[PDB]
Ligand binder design. Structure first.
Ligand code: NA
Ligand code: NA
Ligand code: NA
Lengths: 274, 234, 213, 274, 234, 274, 234, 81
RNA sequence: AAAA
RNA sequence: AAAA
RNA sequence: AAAA
C-alpha cells in the first residue's frame, strides 16, 4: 500500500526572487548568465568508482550524479530467454538536498530509474540479446545503480548522461566453463550501439528553458523530457510537474530539445572516446 | 514485432481502422460510501474510482497552508491481468500514481480548500492497455460526481505506431508488440495537456502525426464524459 | 435481602462476589456492582467499615491523581511556560512557571530541570485533564537534600497505619507522599532503612527488624 | 513486529441515532423496514472481471465485493504433495469507506481472508487433491483475491458469497506437455462439491440481528459468524467485536443463523446455476 | 485422519479420557520490569505475558477520550514449534492478536483510564495446541497481577472431535489430525463468552455437546486461576 | 533506508539518584552491596523450552534471557560449501522494559545478535565444518534465537551465556537417506570445542564496573565488552555507548574483564556439566 | 588462511611494511547543497559524507531538551564492492550506523543546540577494508567543514594480525584472510577512544602491541586531517 | 472533548470548535467536566475565514444541546431546494 | 527487472 | 547468515 | 498458503 501526495515542505522560494529570475528572461539570459537554450558546464569522469565494472561521475552545474554498474551471471527471465537483463536503480541520497531523508526510493527516485530505464531499453542502445552466454540457461545481468550526490536541478538529464557513460565504461570479464567469472581477465566492454541523451525543457511562465537549475525548477509550471538517439529518433518522452502545458508548448519544446540534443550528443561522444 | 498488427485488409487485430476508438462505457455514483465514484470502460480496460471529499488532513504538517493536497492511488487488482499480478505496488504502479496525480493537479481548484486532503483511489479491474488514462478519466469523473470544483474534465487516449502505421487507442497486443505507445491527456476546452509520455520510438514527424490523431480522439471521448455526467439530469 | 458473602479480611480476586443486595456504597474502582451483586475487580483484600464494604488493592504500580494530594514528582521536560512532571500516574503532571514564580515569565528567562525532584500538591485534575501541580505551599518545591525511595502507591497506607508505621520507621527523617514515593534524610548506613521498606511491600513487626540491623 | 489496538477514530454515531434504531426493534423491524432475520437485497454478477479466470460481483444492500480468481501451475507444498493450493486475499480498499486508507492488509482484511479461507478449506467444498496434474511435481494454485469496493455492513458474509461464486465461475485451461497452459482452450470449470455460506448475526442490545447494516454494526455489542454447507454442518465459527455474549446468546444465534442459511443457500444456488 | 486418535481402550494418544484436561501450572510476577507478569502452562503449551500499566498514549490522536486503548501482541518464538517458525508475524499471528485483544476488551474496566494505553505482550515459548487460549489466560493473569481492575478473569479451553469423539483440551496431534477444533473463552462468574471460534466441522448437535464440555473444563481452570492468584497471600 | 539517532525518551534518572550510586563507589561497593568486580547471582536452566532442540533460560540479577536453537537441513552458502550455517537473532521483547515497543529488531537487537554471533564464530567454539552432511550439497543450519524477557542491565553478557548454554544443550537427530530428519531419534549433541564468555565493563565516572545493573547502565559514560575462550584469548571486543574512554581506561578494563572471565568460565562450565 | 599475507621478503601483499599506511587523500566542500561535505580515501577505500547543519527536529518528541540529536547513516553503494551489494541496509550496515554515530557523539558539542537534529550521511563508494573508519573520518571532516563545533577531529585506523604479524591499516585481503582485525578511532589531542572493536582473535599481549601500533598510525592520519582542513586558507 | 472546549463535526472540510467559556458564559472551574461525543448541538458560526477552523457559538436562542427529536442528513447543496 |  |  |  501507498499513495502519491502533493509535496508539502518544499523549497519555499520568496516572491521577490521569482520576479528577478524572469526579469532577465525578457532578454534571453538567466541568473548564471546563460541563454534560455544552453546547458550548464558539463563534466564527466569515467572509472571514478574503482570497484565498479564501469562508472562515470557527472557534474552538470552543481548537480552531481555517480552511476556504477555491476555485471552478474543469471538465468534469463522466462519472457526473455534470449536476452540479458538490465536493472536500473536511482537513489536520491539525503546527501543531495536538505529535504531528502533516507529510506527506500520515493516516487521520484523510482520515476527517475524508470525513465532512464525506458530511454535505454526503448532506444535499443543496449542490445540485450548480446548478453546471452548459453541461450535460455545463462545471461549477463547488467545492474545499473545511479546515485545523486548533489541536487542542483535537472537531475534526470544528468542521470541519463551518467548511465550512458557508465555503460560505455563497463568492463566485461572472461567466463569459465566447468560456469564461473574470472575477474582477473577483462575480455571486453559492454557492446553499445550508440549513446542516448535526455533533454529536459522547463516551462517557466511564457518561457521555455533548457536544463533548469534549482531555483528555476522551483518556479517552473512543469517540465518535459525528450530522449534522443544520434539519428534523432524520439525514444522516450515524459511530462512531469503539477502544471499543464499547451499543445504548442510541447511542440516548441521538442523542437528545442532535439536541437539541443545534437550538441549534447557530440559533447558526450567526446567524453566517451567514441 | 511477431504477430501481424495491421492485416492485408489494412485493419487492426480487433477489426478497427487506425483512426477508430474502442467502445466506451461510463457509470457514475456507483459507490454509496464515497463522496464521488465512477466506472470507465474503454474496450476491455476497466477502472473504478472513489473520491473522498475535501477533509482536514490530520498530520497536519503534511497539509498545505494555501491549497488542498491531492492523494492519489493507481493500483491494479491481481486478476486485472492475464497472469496474476502480485497486489504489492510495483515500480510501475508507483510511477503511474504520481503521473496521474500530477495530471489532476492542473484540473482541481485546490486553493478553494487550504489545509485539506482530497483522496482519489482508482482500481484497475481489467487491464487491456491504456489503463493509466482510463484510471485518470475515472478519477476526473469521480471528482465531478463528488462536486469538487475543477477547471475542466480530463480526456485521454494512447496513440502509437504498429507496423509503421500511426494508430488510435491501442489494445494490449498493440502495446506489447508495437513500435511506440504514447498516452496523452488534456483538459480539452482549455487546450492544456495534463499527461504526456512516450515509450518506444518515433521520428519527430511520426510524433506530430500521432499527436494530432490523439487530439481528435480525445474530443470524441470528452463529449462522452460530458453526456455521461449530464445523463441522469436529462 | 441484604448480605455480605465473604469473611472480612479475605483474599479477594477479580470476578469474586463480595455481597448481594442493595447497599449504599460510594462508587469505587475496586468494586463492581452488577444489579444486586457486588464483585471485586482486582487482586485485593475484602474489608467492611461499619456497614459499608471495600476492596483494598494488593497490586498496582500506578498512582491516581486526587485534587490536593501531596506528591513528589520528577521533572521530565521543560516547556515554554512550565515543566512536565512525572508523578508516577497514568498521566503526566504539569507545573506552571507562573505558579512557581508567583509572576509572569520575563523576557529571556530560563529552577527545575530534568532529573529534579519536586514536592508538590495537585491544584487541578479530573477525568478530562492531566494533573496540574502547585508549589505555592510550605515545604513544597525543589528537592535538594535527602533521598527518594519508590514503592507501590497501593502500599502507602500500610507504611502509615494509625500513624503507627511512620513512627517506627523514623527510629531517620522521612516524608511519605501519596504519590507512592518517600523523601528521606538520615548516615548512609542508617539510610539502609530502604531494606525495611522493601520488606513491607513484601508482607502487606519490622520494629524488631531494624533494632538488630 | 506489530500489535492489535482498540480502533480510535471510528464512525462516531450520535446518541439519538442509537435510540431510534432500537425503537423499531421492539416491533421486529429495522430502519430499512426488514425483519430481524432478513438479509438485504442480494445481487450476484458472474464473469464480471473479464480477465479473471472466474469472478463474481456481489451487491448486498450497499455493501459491494468483487472476487476474482487466477489459476497458476506450481510445485506443491511439501506438507501437501498430493493437493493443489488455495490462497485467499481480501483487500478493504480505501474506496469502500472514508476511514480505510491504503497499504498492506490490516488485521481486518487478514481476519476476513482467513475466515473465508477456513470456511472454504474446512468445508471440503474445494477438494484440493483434484487440482493435481502430475502428483508431487505440479499442481494448480487457485488464487482468490477479494476486493471490497463499498463498505456497508456485513462485509464477511458478502466476501464468502463472492468467493464461492467466483470459484464456481472459474474457467480452467488445457495443459500442454513438452508443461504449459493453453489459455486459448478452456477445458472445464473448477470442481466444487457444493456451495458454502457464512451467516453473521449481530447482537444489538437485547436483540439478535441477521446481516447488520453499517449503522447497526456501529452500535452492536459483538457479532458471530457461522459457516454452513448444504447438509447444514457447521464448518466455521468466528466471534468478533469488543463485547461479550452469553452462552444462550450464542446458542440462539446458531439456531437463527442455520435457519437463515437454508434460504441463503437456495438463493445462492439459483444465482450460480446449480 | 491417519494416526488413531482414540485407542481401543477408548483413551487418547496421551492416555487422557475425552473429558480430561492437561496439567496446568501458573506463575505470577516473573518479570521485575513489567507492571504485571505471568506464565501459564497447559500440558506442553507454554506462554508468558507482560502488562505495562495504564500510561498516557503519546500520539495522542490514537487515544480514546472516554476509555483506555488496549494494545496486544500474540507472538510465537521461533523455537516454540517443531520446525522453526520465522519470527516475522504470520497472518495467523495477526488474526490471533486481534481475537485475543477483543477477548480482553470485555474484561478490562478501560473507562477508568481515558486517553491511556495498556500494553499486553504475550509470547508462546512452547506450542502444543491451544496457545491462543493459554496466551489469553496469561494475559488475564498478568493484568490481575498488575492491579489493572477487571470484571473477571478469563478462562478458556479448546474442545474438538477426534474419530467422532468429542474431546476436551486438545494436544497438538488432535488439532492437526482431528475433525474439529473449537477454542472457547469466558468470564465464568458472569457467564459471558469472550473468545469463540471453530475450525473443522461439526453437526449442530456435536457443537452443543462440545460447547457443554468446554464450560465444565473452563470451571476447573477458573478455580485454578483463582487459587494461583491467592497463593502468595495465603 | 534507515538511520541511527540519539535515543530520546529514555530512563531519565534523577540527579540525587546518581549522586548516591557513586557514593558507595568510593568504598568499593554498589547499591546491591557488591564489589566493583562482581557479577550478580547467576542462574541457568537448560532444556527450558521443550520444543527447542536446545535451550537455556538465564537469570542474571533481574535480567532474563531465553536462548533456543532449531536445527535444519540446507544447501550450504556458496562461499562456504564445506560448513554448516550459524544464524543468530536477538529479540528485545516489549516484555523486557517499558520502552521497548514491538516490531523488527532495532539497532540494539541487531548489534546484540552480531556481537554474540562474532564471539561464537570468531572463537571457533562451534566448528561449522562439523555440521556438513554431504559436502557441498547439504549441511546443518543452526538457528539461534535469543529472547530478552526482562531488561535489568548487562543484556549482552547474558545473551552470550544463554547462547553458549543453548548450543551445549542442543540435541541432534538421525538423518535418513532415500534425506529426511528422524526426530524420534536423537543421535548426539552439537559438537562444541569449548565455552565462551563476554564480559562487559562499564565506565561510571572515575570508576570501572563489571556487570552493570539498570541504574548503573543509565549513568555510565560508556561500556566495553570483551569475549574470551578458556585459554583466555580475546575473541571479540565491542565499545558501545555515547561516551569516550581513555587508552588507560580500556587497558585496565580488559585486565579486569579477563580476570573476571576466569571465574565466569568455571561457573558456566559447572552449569553446563562440562 | 589460504593466500600468503606476509611474503618471504617480510612485506605485505601490496608491498607495504607492517607499520605502513595506505595513501590518503581528502577533499572538502564537495557538495554545494550540503552544509558540510568531505571525501576521504584510504588506499582503495573511498567515502563521502554530507552534514545538514543544526535544524529544529520536527517530531518533536524525538528531540532532546538539553542537546542536539545526531542522526547518522552508514551505507555502501551497490558497486562499492567486488560483487554487487543489495542497496537495502544489511544487519552489518545497521550496526555500523550506530557505532559511527556513538563515536561522533563524544566529539560534537551537541548541547550548544538543544531540540535540534544534525544529519550525517556517509556513502561508501569503494570498499577495500576499513570503511567504517573512513566513513567516520569523512563525517568528522564534514562536521568541521559545516562549522558545527567539536571537541576534536576523529582519526581512526584498523590494526590486525596476519600470519602472526601485527599489521597497520589492513587492505581487504588482510581483513578476509587474517587472524584479527581491530578498528580503532580517537580524538587524538584528548587521548580519548571513540570507536573500538575487534573481530578475530588475539592474545592479550598481541592486543596491546596492536593497540600501540594503532595510536602511532592515528597520529599520522590526524596531522593529515588537520592540514587538509587548513589547506584552502593557507 | 478538549481541555477548554469541544470539537464539533459540522459536516464541512474543517472541524468546528466550541469554547467552554461560550457555553458556560464564564471560565472553567477547577475540576469541572454538558456535551460529549455523540451529542448533537445546534449552533452558529461565530468565527471563520480561509485561515482558521470554524468556531461555534451557542449563546443564542434555541441553540445548544439537542435533546429530543431526530436528525436527518442530506447534501448541503440540496438545502435551498 | 520490463510489459499490461 | 558472515565478510568487505 | 494452511496447521501448531
Ligand atoms: Na506514487
Ligand atoms: Na493484529
Ligand atoms: Na542503525
Amino acid at each position: 500500500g501507498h499513495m502519491s501526495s502533493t509535496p508539502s515542505n518544499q523549497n519555499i522560494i520568496p516572491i521577490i526572487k521569482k520576479e528577478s529570475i524572469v526579469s532577465l528572461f525578457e532578454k534571453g539570459i538567466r541568473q548564471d548568465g546563460r541563454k534560455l537554450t544552453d546547458y550548464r558546464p558539463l563534466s564527466i569522469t569515467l572509472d571514478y568508482a574503482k570497484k565498479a565494472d564501469g562508472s562515470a561521475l557527472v557534474k552538470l552545474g552543481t548537480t552531481m550524479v555517480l552511476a556504477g554498474t555491476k555485471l552478474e551471471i543469471d538465468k534469463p527471465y522466462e519472457d526473455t530467454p534470449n536476452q540479458g537483463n538490465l536493472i536500473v536503480n536511482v537513489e536520491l541520497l539525503p546527501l543531495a538536498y536538505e529535504t531528502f531523508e533516507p529510506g527506500p526510493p520515493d516516487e521520484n527516485a523510482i520515476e527517475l530509474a524508470r525513465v532512464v530505464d525506458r530511454s535505454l531499453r526503448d532506444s535499443k542502445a543496449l542490445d540485450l540479446t548480446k548478453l546471452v552466454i548459453e541461450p535460455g540457461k545463462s545471461v549477463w545481468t547488467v545492474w545499473l545503480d545511479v546515485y545523486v550526490l548533489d541536487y542542483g536541478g535537472n537531475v534526470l538529464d544528468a542521470c541519463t548522461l551518467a548511465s550512458v557513460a557508465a555503460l560505455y565504461n563497463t568492463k566485461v570479464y572472461k567466463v569459465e566453463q566447468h560456469i564461473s567469472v574470472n575477474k582477473n581477465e577483462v575480455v571486453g566492454k559492454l557492446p553499445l550501439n550508440y549513446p542516448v541523451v535526455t533533454i529536459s525543457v522547463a516551462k517557466v511562465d511564457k518561457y521555455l528553458v533548457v536544463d533548469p537549475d534549482l531555483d528555476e525548477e522551483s518556479i517552473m509550471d512543469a517540465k518535459i523530457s525528450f530522449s534522443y538517439t544520434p539519428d534523432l529518433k524520439i525514444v522516450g518522452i515524459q511530462k512531469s510537474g503539477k502544471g499543464s502545458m499547451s499543445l504548442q508548448d510541447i511542440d516548441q519544446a521538442e523542437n528545442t530539445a532535439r536541437s539541443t540534443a545534437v550538441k549534447l550528443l557530440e559533447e558526450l561522444k567526446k567524453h566517451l572516446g567514441i | 514485432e511477431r504477430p501481424k498488427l495491421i492485416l492485408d485488409d489494412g485493419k487492426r487485430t480487433d477489426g478497427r481502422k487506425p483512426d477508430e476508438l474502442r467502445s466506451i462505457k461510463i457509470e457514475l455514483g456507483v459507490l454509496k460510501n464515497a463522496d464521488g465514484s465512477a466506472i470507465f470502460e474503454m474496450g476491455n480496460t476497466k477502472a473504478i474510482a472513489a473520491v473522498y471529499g475535501p477533509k482536514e488532513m490530520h498530520p497536519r504538517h503534511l497539509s498545505l497552508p494555501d491549497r488542498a493536497v491531492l492523494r492519489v492511488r493507481y493500483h491494479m487488482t491481481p486478476f486485472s491481468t492475464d497472469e496474476r499480478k502480485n497486489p504489492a505496488p510495483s515500480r510501475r504502479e508507483i510511477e503511474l500514481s504520481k503521473v496521474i496525480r500530477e495530471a489532476l493537479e492542473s484540473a482541481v481548484l485546490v486553493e478553494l480548500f487550504p489545509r485539506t486532503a482530497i483522496d482519489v483511489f482508482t482500481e484497475i479491474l481489467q487491464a487491456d492497455a491504456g489503463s493509466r488514462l482510463v484510471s485518470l478519466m475515472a478519477a476526473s469523473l469521480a471528482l465531478a460526481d463528488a462536486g469538487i470544483p475543477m477547471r475542466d474534465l480530463i480526456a485521454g487516449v494512447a496513440v502509437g505506431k504498429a507496423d509503421g502505421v500511426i494508430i488510435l487507442d491501442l489494445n494490449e497486443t498493440e502495446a506489447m508488440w508495437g513500435e511506440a505507445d504514447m498516452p496523452i491527456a488534456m483538459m480539452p476546452s482549455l487546450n492544456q495537456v495534463t499527461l504526456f509520455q512516450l515509450n518506444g520510438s518515433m521520428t519527430p514527424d511520426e510524433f506530430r502525426q500521432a499527436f494530432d490523431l490523439a487530439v481528435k480522439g480525445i474530443n470524441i471521448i470528452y463529449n462522452l464524459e460530458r453526456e455521461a455526467l449530464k445523463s441522469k439530469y436529462v | 435481602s441484604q448480605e455480605i458473602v465473604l469473611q472480612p479480611r479475605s483474599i479477594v480476586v477479580p470476578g469474586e462476589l463480595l455481597a448481594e443486595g442493595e447497599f449504599q456504597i460510594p462508587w469505587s474502582p475496586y468494586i463492581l456492582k452488577i444489579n444486586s451483586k457486588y464483585y471485586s475487580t482486582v487482586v485485593g483484600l475484602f474489608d467492611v467499615k461499619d456497614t459499608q464494604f471495600e476492596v483494598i488493592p494488593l497490586e498496582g504500580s500506578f498512582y491516581y491523581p486526587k485534587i490536593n494530594d501531596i506528591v513528589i514528582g520528577l521533572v521530565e521536560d521543560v516547556e515554554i511556560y512550565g515543566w512536565v512532571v512525572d508523578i508516577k500516574a497514568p498521566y503526566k503532571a504539569y507545573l506552571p512557571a507562573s505558579n512557581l514564580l508567583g509572576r509572569s515569565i520575563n523576557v529571556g528567562e530560563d529552577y527545575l530541570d530534568v532529573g529534579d525532584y519536586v514536592i508538590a500538591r495537585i491544584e487541578n485534575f479530573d477525568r478530562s485533564i492531566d494533573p496540574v501541580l502547585s508549589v505555592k505551599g510550605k515545604d513544597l518545591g525543589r528537592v535538594s537534600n535527602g533521598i527518594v525511595i519508590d514503592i507501590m502507591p497501593v502500599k502507602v497506607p500500610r507504611v502509615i497505619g494509625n500513624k503507627s508505621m511512620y513512627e517506627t520507621l523514623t527510629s531517620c527523617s522521612i516524608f511519605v507522599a501519596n504519590n507512592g514515593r518517600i523523601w528521606a534524610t538520615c548516615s548512609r548506613f542508617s539510610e539502609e532503612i530502604l531494606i525495611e521498606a522493601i520488606r513491607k511491600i513484601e508482607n502487606e513487626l519490622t520494629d524488631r527488624i531494624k533494632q538488630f540491623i
